[PDB]
Amino acid sequence: RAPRRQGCWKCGKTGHVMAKCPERQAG
Ligand SMILES: [Zn+2]
């Protein structure tokens, strides 16, 4: 899943997305 949304689809930053961001729930 390439970073097509340019960064997370919630934080708004590259280098990681909503799947790799530091806060993606992950329960
Ligand atoms: Zn991020």
UniProtKB/Swiss-Prot annotation:
Location relative to the cell: Virion
Zinc finger regions, CCHC-type: 6-23
Biological function: Encapsulates and protects viral dimeric unspliced genomic RNA (gRNA). Binds these RNAs through its zinc fingers. Acts as a nucleic acid chaperone which is involved in rearangement of nucleic acid secondary structure during gRNA retrotranscription. Also facilitates template switch leading to recombination. As part of the polyprotein, participates in gRNA dimerization, packaging, tRNA incorporation and virion assembly.
Name used for this protein in its record: Nucleocapsid protein p7
Region of the whole protein represented: 406 to 432 of 1464
